[PDB]
Amino acid sequence: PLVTPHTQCRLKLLKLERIKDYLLMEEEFIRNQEQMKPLEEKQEEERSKVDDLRGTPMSVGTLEEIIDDNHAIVSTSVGSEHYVSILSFVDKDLLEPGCSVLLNHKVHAVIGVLMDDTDPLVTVMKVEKAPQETYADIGGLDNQIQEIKESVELPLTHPEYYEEMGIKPPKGVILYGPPGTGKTLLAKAVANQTSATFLRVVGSELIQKYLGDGPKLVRELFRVAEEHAPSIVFIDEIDAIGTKRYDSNSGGEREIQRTMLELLNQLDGFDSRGDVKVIMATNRIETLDPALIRPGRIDRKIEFPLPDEKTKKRIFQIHTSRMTLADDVTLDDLIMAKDDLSGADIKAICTEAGLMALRERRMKVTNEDFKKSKENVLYKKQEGTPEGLYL
Amino acid sequence: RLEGGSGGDSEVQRTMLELLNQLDGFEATKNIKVIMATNRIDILDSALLR
Amino acid sequence: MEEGGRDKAPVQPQQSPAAAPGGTDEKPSGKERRDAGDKDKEQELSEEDKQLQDELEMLVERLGEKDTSLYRPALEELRRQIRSSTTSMTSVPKPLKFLRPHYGKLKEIYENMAPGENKRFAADIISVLAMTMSGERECLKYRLVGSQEELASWGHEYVRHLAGEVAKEWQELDDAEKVQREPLLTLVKEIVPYNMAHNAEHEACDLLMEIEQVDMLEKDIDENAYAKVCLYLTSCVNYVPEPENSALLRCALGVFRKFSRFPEALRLALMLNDMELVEDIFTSCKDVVVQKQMAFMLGRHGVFLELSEDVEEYEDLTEIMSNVQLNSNFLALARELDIMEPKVPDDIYKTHLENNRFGGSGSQVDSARMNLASSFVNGFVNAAFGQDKLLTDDGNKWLYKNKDHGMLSAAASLGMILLWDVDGGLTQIDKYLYSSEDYIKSGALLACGIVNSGVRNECDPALALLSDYVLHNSNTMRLGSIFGLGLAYAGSNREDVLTLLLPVMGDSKSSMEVAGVTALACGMIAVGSCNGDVTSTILQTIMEKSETELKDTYARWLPLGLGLNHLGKGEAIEAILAALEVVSEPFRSFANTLVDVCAYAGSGNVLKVQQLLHICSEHFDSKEKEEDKDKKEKKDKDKKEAPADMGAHQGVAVLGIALIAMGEEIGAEMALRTFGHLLRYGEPTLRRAVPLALALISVSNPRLNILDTLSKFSHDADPEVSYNSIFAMGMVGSGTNNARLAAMLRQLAQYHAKDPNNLFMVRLAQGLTHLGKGTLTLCPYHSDRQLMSQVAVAGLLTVLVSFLDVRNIILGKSHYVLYGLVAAMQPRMLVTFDEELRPLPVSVRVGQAVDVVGQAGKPKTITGFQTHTTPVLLAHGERAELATEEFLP
Amino acid sequence: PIRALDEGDIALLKTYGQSTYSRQIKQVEDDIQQLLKKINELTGIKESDTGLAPPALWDLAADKQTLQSEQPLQVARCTKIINADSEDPKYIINVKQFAKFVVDLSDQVAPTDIEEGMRVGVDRNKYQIHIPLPPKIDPTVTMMQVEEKPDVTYSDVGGCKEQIEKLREVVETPLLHPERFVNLGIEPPKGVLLFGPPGTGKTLCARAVANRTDACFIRVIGSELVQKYVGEGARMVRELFEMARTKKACLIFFDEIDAIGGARFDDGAGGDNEVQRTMLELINQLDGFDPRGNIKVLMATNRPDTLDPALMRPGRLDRKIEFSLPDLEGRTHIFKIHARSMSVERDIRFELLARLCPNSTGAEIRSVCTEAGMFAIRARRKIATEKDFLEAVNKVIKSYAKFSATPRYMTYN
Amino acid sequence: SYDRAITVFSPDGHLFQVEYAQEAVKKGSTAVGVRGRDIVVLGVEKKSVAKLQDERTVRKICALDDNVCMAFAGLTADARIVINRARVECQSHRLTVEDPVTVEYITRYIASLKQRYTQSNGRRPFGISALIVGFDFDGTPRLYQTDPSGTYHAWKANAIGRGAKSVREFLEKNYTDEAIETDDLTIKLVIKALLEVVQSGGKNIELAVMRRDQSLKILNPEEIEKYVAEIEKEKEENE
Numbered sequence A: 001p002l003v004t005p006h007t008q009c010r011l012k013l014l015k016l017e018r019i020k021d022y023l024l025m026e027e028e029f030i031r032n033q034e035q036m037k038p039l040e041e042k043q044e045e046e047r048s049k050v051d052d053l054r055g056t057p058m059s060v061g062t063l064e065e066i067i068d069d070n071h072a073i074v075s076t077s078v079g080s081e082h083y084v085s086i087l088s089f090v091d092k093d094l095l096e097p098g099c100s101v102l103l104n105h106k107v108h109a110v111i112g113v114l115m116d117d118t119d120p121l122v123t124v125m126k127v128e129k130a131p132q133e134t135y136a137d138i139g140g141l142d143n144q145i146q147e148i149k150e151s152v153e154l155p156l157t158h159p160e161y162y163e164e165m166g167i168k169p170p171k172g173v174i175l176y177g178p179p180g181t182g183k184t185l186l187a188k189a190v191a192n193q194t195s196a197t198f199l200r201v202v203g204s205e206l207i208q209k210y211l212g213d214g215p216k217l218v219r220e221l222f223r224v225a226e227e228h229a230p231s232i233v234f235i236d237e238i239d240a241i242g243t244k245r246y247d248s249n250s251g252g253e254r255e256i257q258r259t260m261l262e263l264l265n266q267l268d269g270f271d272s273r274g275d276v277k278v279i280m281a282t283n284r285i286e287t288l289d290p291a292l293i294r295p296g297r298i299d300r301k302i303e304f305p306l307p308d309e310k311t312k313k314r315i316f317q318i319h320t321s322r323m324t325l326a327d328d329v330t331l332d333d334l335i336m337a338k339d340d341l342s343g344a345d346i347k348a349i350c351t352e353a354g355l356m357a358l359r360e361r362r363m364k365v366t367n368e369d370f371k372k373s374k375e376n377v378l379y380k381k382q383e384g385t386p387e388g389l390y391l
Numbered sequence B: 001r002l003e004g005g006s007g008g009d010s011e012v013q014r015t016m017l018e019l020l021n022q023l024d025g026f027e028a029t030k031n032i033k034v035i036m037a038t039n040r041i042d043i044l045d046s047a048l049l050r
Numbered sequence C: 001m002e003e004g005g006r007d008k009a010p011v012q013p014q015q016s017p018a019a020a021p022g023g024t025d026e027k028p029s030g031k032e033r034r035d036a037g038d039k040d041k042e043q044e045l046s047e048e049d050k051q052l053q054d055e056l057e058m059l060v061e062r063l064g065e066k067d068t069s070l071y072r073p074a075l076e077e078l079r080r081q082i083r084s085s086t087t088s089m090t091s092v093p094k095p096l097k098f099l100r101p102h103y104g105k106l107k108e109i110y111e112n113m114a115p116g117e118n119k120r121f122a123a124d125i126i127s128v129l130a131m132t133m134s135g136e137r138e139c140l141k142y143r144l145v146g147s148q149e150e151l152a153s154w155g156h157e158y159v160r161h162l163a164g165e166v167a168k169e170w171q172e173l174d175d176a177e178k179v180q181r182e183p184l185l186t187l188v189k190e191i192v193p194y195n196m197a198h199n200a201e202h203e204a205c206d207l208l209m210e211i212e213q214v215d216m217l218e219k220d221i222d223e224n225a226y227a228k229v230c231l232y233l234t235s236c237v238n239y240v241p242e243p244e245n246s247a248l249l250r251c252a253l254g255v256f257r258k259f260s261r262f263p264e265a266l267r268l269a270l271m272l273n274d275m276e277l278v279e280d281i282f283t284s285c286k287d288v289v290v291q292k293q294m295a296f297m298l299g300r301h302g303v304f305l306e307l308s309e310d311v312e313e314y315e316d317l318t319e320i321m322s323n324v325q326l327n328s329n330f331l332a333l334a335r336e337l338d339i340m341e342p343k344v345p346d347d348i349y350k351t352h353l354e355n356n357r358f359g360g361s362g363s364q365v366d367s368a369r370m371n372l373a374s375s376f377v378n379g380f381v382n383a384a385f386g387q388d389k390l391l392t393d394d395g396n397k398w399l400y401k402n403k404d405h406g407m408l409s410a411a412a413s414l415g416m417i418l419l420w421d422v423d424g425g426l427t428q429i430d431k432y433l434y435s436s437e438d439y440i441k442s443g444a445l446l447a448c449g450i451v452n453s454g455v456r457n458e459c460d461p462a463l464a465l466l467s468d469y470v471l472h473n474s475n476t477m478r479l480g481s482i483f484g485l486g487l488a489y490a491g492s493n494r495e496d497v498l499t500l501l502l503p504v505m506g507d508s509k510s511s512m513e514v515a516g517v518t519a520l521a522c523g524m525i526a527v528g529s530c531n532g533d534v535t536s537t538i539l540q541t542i543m544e545k546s547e548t549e550l551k552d553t554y555a556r557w558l559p560l561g562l563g564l565n566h567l568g569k570g571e572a573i574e575a576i577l578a579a580l581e582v583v584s585e586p587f588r589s590f591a592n593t594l595v596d597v598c599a600y601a602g603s604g605n606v607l608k609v610q611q612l613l614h615i616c617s618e619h620f621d622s623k624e625k626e627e628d629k630d631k632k633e634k635k636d637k638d639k640k641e642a643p644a645d646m647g648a649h650q651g652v653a654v655l656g657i658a659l660i661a662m663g664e665e666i667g668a669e670m671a672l673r674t675f676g677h678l679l680r681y682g683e684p685t686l687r688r689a690v691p692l693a694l695a696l697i698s699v700s701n702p703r704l705n706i707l708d709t710l711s712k713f714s715h716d717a718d719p720e721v722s723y724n725s726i727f728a729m730g731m732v733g734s735g736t737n738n739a740r741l742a743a744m745l746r747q748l749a750q751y752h753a754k755d756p757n758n759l760f761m762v763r764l765a766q767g768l769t770h771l772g773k774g775t776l777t778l779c780p781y782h783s784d785r786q787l788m789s790q791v792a793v794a795g796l797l798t799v800l801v802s803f804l805d806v807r808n809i810i811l812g813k814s815h816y817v818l819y820g821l822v823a824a825m826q827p828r829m830l831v832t833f834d835e836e837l838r839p840l841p842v843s844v845r846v847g848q849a850v851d852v853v854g855q856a857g858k859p860k861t862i863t864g865f866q867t868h869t870t871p872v873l874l875a876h877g878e879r880a881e882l883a884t885e886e887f888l889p
Numbered sequence D: 001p002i003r004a005l006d007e008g009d010i011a012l013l014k015t016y017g018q019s020t021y022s023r024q025i026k027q028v029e030d031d032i033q034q035l036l037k038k039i040n041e042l043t044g045i046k047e048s049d050t051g052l053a054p055p056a057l058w059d060l061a062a063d064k065q066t067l068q069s070e071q072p073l074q075v076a077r078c079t080k081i082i083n084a085d086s087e088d089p090k091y092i093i094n095v096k097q098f099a100k101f102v103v104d105l106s107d108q109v110a111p112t113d114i115e116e117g118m119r120v121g122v123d124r125n126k127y128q129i130h131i132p133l134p135p136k137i138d139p140t141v142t143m144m145q146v147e148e149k150p151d152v153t154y155s156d157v158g159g160c161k162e163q164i165e166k167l168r169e170v171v172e173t174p175l176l177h178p179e180r181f182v183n184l185g186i187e188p189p190k191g192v193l194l195f196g197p198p199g200t201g202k203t204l205c206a207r208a209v210a211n212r213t214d215a216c217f218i219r220v221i222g223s224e225l226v227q228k229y230v231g232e233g234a235r236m237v238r239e240l241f242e243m244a245r246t247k248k249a250c251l252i253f254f255d256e257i258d259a260i261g262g263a264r265f266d267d268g269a270g271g272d273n274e275v276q277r278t279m280l281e282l283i284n285q286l287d288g289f290d291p292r293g294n295i296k297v298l299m300a301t302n303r304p305d306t307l308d309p310a311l312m313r314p315g316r317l318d319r320k321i322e323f324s325l326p327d328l329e330g331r332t333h334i335f336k337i338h339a340r341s342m343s344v345e346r347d348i349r350f351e352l353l354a355r356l357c358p359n360s361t362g363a364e365i366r367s368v369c370t371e372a373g374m375f376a377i378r379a380r381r382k383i384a385t386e387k388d389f390l391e392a393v394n395k396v397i398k399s400y401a402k403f404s405a406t407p408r409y410m411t412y413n
Numbered sequence E: 001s002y003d004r005a006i007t008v009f010s011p012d013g014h015l016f017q018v019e020y021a022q023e024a025v026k027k028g029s030t031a032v033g034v035r036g037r038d039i040v041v042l043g044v045e046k047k048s049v050a051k052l053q054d055e056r057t058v059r060k061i062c063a064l065d066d067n068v069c070m071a072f073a074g075l076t077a078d079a080r081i082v083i084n085r086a087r088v089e090c091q092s093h094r095l096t097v098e099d100p101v102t103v104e105y106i107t108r109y110i111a112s113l114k115q116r117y118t119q120s121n122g123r124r125p126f127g128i129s130a131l132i133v134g135f136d137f138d139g140t141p142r143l144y145q146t147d148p149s150g151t152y153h154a155w156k157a158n159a160i161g162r163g164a165k166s167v168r169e170f171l172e173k174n175y176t177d178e179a180i181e182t183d184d185l186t187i188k189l190v191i192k193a194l195l196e197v198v199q200s201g202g203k204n205i206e207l208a209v210m211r212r213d214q215s216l217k218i219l220n221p222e223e224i225e226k227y228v229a230e231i232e233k234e235k236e237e238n239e
């Protein structure tokens, strides 16, 4: 992530060709690795007959009980239960009733044991790519940047400060405020610069219709996070997961309400938690369940207000990084004159003014682009609130 | 987004939050464009109008 | 689509150049005046860079391309003025008249005759007219001429001054970030004759500006971070005179032309050392120019400042040599007893207290080889004045109890207790010296070289350890006497005691470990001349190693001093010297990869890195040259630790996947010493990737291979929270990972991270990036650990006192003459700023705020405020001078 | 009158401004991302190795014995027996998934141990009984028998000197002195509900009695009772209330019984039907015919209003212990619990801190104790001062509890 | 939850409908005021003329009696009732007791009239806050303030309206214990205080002073422009 000239300079032509040099050599070295292998023994006769000892259509079974005389009991998908033996090379030390095993068809015998057993709905929510830029991307939020770093990055990088006072770091963080402020950016910048793994949850993702399929996916969600790295979990748009826990008349409302009541249990209920951090985000905060807002579950409440006349300069500066800017413009024209508008408004102004230059056959962008752009973006919010009663 | 209680609707919002997020979530999409067309400008929600 | 009605320019400049063949002949006025009316108007519709779409420039050539093909050549009677009207008007649209094979024909309109002073109609326009087109000429057209035929025709002759005025024009129009476009122009034009381009561009820059020097100045050294061998040879000496001739910032000479010492010429920086002795005004920049000249990148400068001004202007030499060294001892004496440290912490051993209740009871460990590691509760914590009377009683009993190699080891630990000392360091040894034993005196008098290491004053050039050496008829008196004095005089390149200790090589007394460390002792001294050392080593090498096919005591020690005597030059003559000198059998051609890449400390020479892979890649090699592919991988570890992190991410990407993943003896035995050589800072990417292959011990091999990778997993200094890994692996490492072999090792790894509180700079990077070797003192240890049987007998000479080039730590002191000032310094996560808006904010981590001797840390360019001007060298370097000035109200 | 695009004017744009390095820098970035892919499929080192033992021990088995245990070994199934008839086998056997057969015994059996309701190994071809089995134990109650001590002493539940006193009477005292109840002529209650505001200490009292129990203790995961299949959740209730009768005096802790049924209604003809069957099965094995004897039930909820009056009846839930907020003497004891194990100044007072938390819980008090040390890491300290706690009270409470009453305060002094 | 009544209490003892009346004060234009040695001064901001109206009917500064002033915030309707009522009491006091009316007596009337106006249901309280400045009580300069709860209170320098928290924090670091004599210096303190306006247009400041012996002296936008010039003269010392 070092393309730091950020412009059409020969350094970025030199830097990226260095990256081309190392990856081509990494290709050619592993190309030589699968090339110059004159070693063939292929099992030394042991695993080769074993791979022929097991059946070729390997099937999947489920343990019920363990009769340890090398003759145990299993269960199939339909529930057909078979007094099968243990055809060998399996240590009887990691097989428990519930752990799924590997079976045959002709004799149904236990050949291996199936590992990791993840239902392929939680593996979709496992992020592999760092999407965007680092903390230097966003346009100045440094009082609240230092807050989230105290609970996520700093306890993982340097947990020597906390043992000197015996204080565990905070676990839950709420991001709340008006829309268009930077909630989704602050999660993506953390997921960029991190060392542990990352999990994203899009709102109504853990909602199904089979009346028990809802809460069952939540158990496997925290199970995967606990079994893997000391990592964090980002669950966004939790306004569709909690509203004050009232009792009413609809029957599909309860399997909604029950799944959202056992997330409470997995979070800060019985004995332990592990090193799992949870980051949650909404637009509205007052319509939430007060059982989730209490400390023990969430220890940080972070406001994201609409910007000022000072850090707004940093918003216009970053979104006008790589565009040809004519020297006629003043950034403080649109900032000081109008004092209401979000950070997502400013990105729309910079894109619209660039479209106005091609609209009148230009490359550079003058003040007259921003005069028409600041109009056209802002005409989507209504006229006003009350007449001159107050003075 | 109305209130809770036995009023408004949750499930209308449950679908709406996914529309609110598959184009603006953790993963930004490319080469997919949406067109929305309706009257009654002031009564659709101020989270997809941003 | 509102076309039509206002298409004036797609009609009348569609007709009048179409009527130009209708009015060239039989119309002498319409040939000229309509051309001039075409020329100025097409010139006028391009000068505003606020209409890129030109109503002529992509409207006329739809017929005008076939017109110009019949107007410029086919006229054949071109006048003196009509060529200045045709070529001035028709060389403008030719980048967009023509497609991507324009690159051979930017000349069939232009170079018929370049009309006059082409910037006359291209001055105020930035690059739309011809300046992009000028770069298109210097890209392809000049390079095919200047590939072998630089001295050539009009494509070089006028093109020189044509590129001269264009390079002036980049810093003329707007003076924007197109300043850096001039090195984009100067280096593409005549890549190898860059200096022939730069010599005109040096003098042009000298008269260009004195404020718009510095960002182009750092643009050069960013391009000089990696290049070809000849480009790094060329643009670094072009870099030298710009703070010498244009400006006189000039305190960036000494270390930032140590950049240019080894590549261009050793005497050239000595002529720049002469240029240091020219600009002697007045003291403050002069002081900190010569602060680095002793113990920051090299020593050996104490012979050139005893000339005719020996009062205070040349009496800084001994002050540089040992007094500011002793003022640095006054850091560890005064300031570092103040911050943290009483005389004996002695309690990282006591931090193993909670283990005795973890699982019932304790007091089960009684291994005698743990008592080797018991010396490092006293040994490592007592560096920088951890002086101990009767706190060495754990040493004093175990010295007089057993363990002859530990009698040498506990005696060698006394030199680490009194380090950087000349005042009373020998007096501490003398009471613990007279025991009349082989092992006691050979460890203590080797430690005497450690005490006066970095001093290089008159302590014992041949006084003590030469008299220790001539006592030999026997064991380590023969060995341990030559090692300490070459360790003490490693910073020097003195010839005399090298010739005193050359008959150690010429004795042919066949003690093998003595001759091996003899190559290591002479290797630490010199890096340049004295080819007779290369002669002396290979004589006994051909005598001894030819009549054997055996252990690496031959191989790990004897070619290594050859590589240390020829370290750090990418000339590739040293490979022609060494490899054609030891043309021999392949177990002696193990030494082929040593002196090849020891001259290749750090640069971008990726063509070497592929021959560092492709020759001996895998082959599966049934137990014949497996040492050579480890040592070929050993030389992959350097040439990676100083392109400044550009290849470090690529190094951890390749060596994590390729070897430890799809390897064999190369990966699962040896390929973790990269991480024990790449960085010593620590970060949880590689610090957690090593216990992926360590918590999985993979015990089927001789597991001390993987437990060697345990050992220098803790080869990261600057103490951390890594105690969680080592103590928990020490808990599984007591019973399992048996304590007979590595109970010394895990606590060697445990006790080395908290060596002192401070003094962790062992990482070969000073100022910003320069080496300061350094390398000659560390690299013997990672060459030593190949692999086993030196955990017991022979490597105990090495494993304690191998690397001893720690230079101090911290950039907190002020030294304004009385040394009373503290500062207001402001420490931050390091710079990222390369080219952005002026001025550029240097760093990003504003939270930490100290005044005085606080820490260095991994990426810290610590700045200061309160208008003290910090004027000294404006880089940093831990002995700032800090004058005072406030003329801004 | 605004139109500015025509295919010739497209060729104006991508030649003006850095024609040298535009594609020259771009395709280098393009093919390296192609090369990010082409390394990955060239590696292909996924390696999901599992099932295999260390390959130094099974060598004796997979020489001939594995081939000897293919054809002579049997793939026999297990079943259940209804009954038998005299002078003959006449064995009537079901599967509950397959059909019901009437089969013969084999030669390798003793005809005595073919008792009714017994799991037996059954042939695949002629379906003869070969091997009788031990009875089935329920697999998921074994998963939720805790077998583990969470470490919370009663000295950490400060502010609740009387709520523990009520809870000590029901759980601990009949299990250690079952005399004074009989020797006076009373019976202890058998069901205790816990209700009140969240974060008040519901889980702590349940976590602390799991420490000092000396008895069978069963945590019950609440949403395991809700299943996908019809009637499956009601069968899970039964197996729980059978094995409790086997051993003596086992403790069962439910938690958040709001989820497993709160109200019984039917107006839209449907809804939470399967939840009601599991919930009513819980009732009839709580009271009814066959009283349970020595089974103590603990429940805890945050929303006690929305529960069924069938559970509100005493005889099922007998003691209503509620948790309130500690007045002042409770909170001053709570600060001394959560701040004794941290580096503080040894001269500060805590009663001034307990003033400024008027309506607060035990969770909110601990959040102040953790936050005050976080201010010490904002500065560079290793001990907490008085103003560290005073800023922490404004950070936790006053940043969310009041914003109009603090600046415009002048109605009260 | 429970507010919707001025007679009910919260479970933690509050009157939210009284507290909501102070929220209506924060929609008003800011007005500051200090006392000095002899000359008291108060200024208002945010004139914002709208090109088509007469500006002598939008006045925010009035006089109750000959030696007492008034500046307010909130909404314009409720201020007109309080002003017109207070003119009667400061005139009927003079009839019953032949003294002039002190500045302390008229503030207790405004607070007590707003007091009983809060107690009874079906009586919406006044959503205004006022500044009473008068150097009337025997040559002594004083200034008080009010509150919609009905609590009269005395400051030495005051700020109200939309943005009072910045100005009140500004004056604490600016009001010197050195008494601002040479009263144009004290007037320049207010113009420096009103320089932190919501937009600071310069020509939107209506300062009104009183030299404690004459009547009210409304400043013109030529004398006030001279004081804005000398504020930029002292600002030239930053370079």
Ligand SMILES: Nc1ncnc2c1ncn2[C@@H]1O[C@H](COP(=O)(O)OP(=O)(O)OP(=O)(O)O)[C@@H](O)[C@H]1O
Residues within 6 Å of the ligand: A137, A138, A139, A140, A141, A178, A179, A180, A181, A182, A183, A184, A185, A186, A282, A283, A315, A318, A343, A344, A347, B024, B047, B050
């Ligand atoms: N402080 C900021 N600096 C720079 N860019 C910003 C900032 N705030 C918002 N943006 C812009 O806003 C976009 C991100 O939207 P944001 O993170 O505000 O969504 P959100 O808060 O999740 O909105 P919603 O709550 O409606 O889902 C980015 O494209 C970014 O360019």
Ligand SMILES: Nc1ncnc2c1ncn2[C@@H]1O[C@H](COP(=O)(O)OP(=O)(O)OP(=O)(O)O)[C@@H](O)[C@H]1O
Residues within 6 Å of the ligand: A268, A291, A296, D156, D157, D158, D159, D160, D197, D198, D199, D200, D201, D202, D203, D204, D301, D302, D334, D337, D361, D362, D363, D364, D366
């Ligand atoms: N009386 C108390 N004394 C000491 N600490 C307390 C007390 N009450 C609560 N705490 C602290 O508050 C934290 C959270 O309390 P807990 O979650 O047990 O409350 P709860 O009532 O069980 O919550 P819920 O009703 O949501 O289940 C506990 O970890 C405990 O440290």
Ligand SMILES: [Mg+2]
Residues within 6 Å of the ligand: A183, A184
């Ligand atoms: Mg969002």
Ligand SMILES: [Mg+2]
Residues within 6 Å of the ligand: A269, D202, D203, D204
């Ligand atoms: Mg609880």
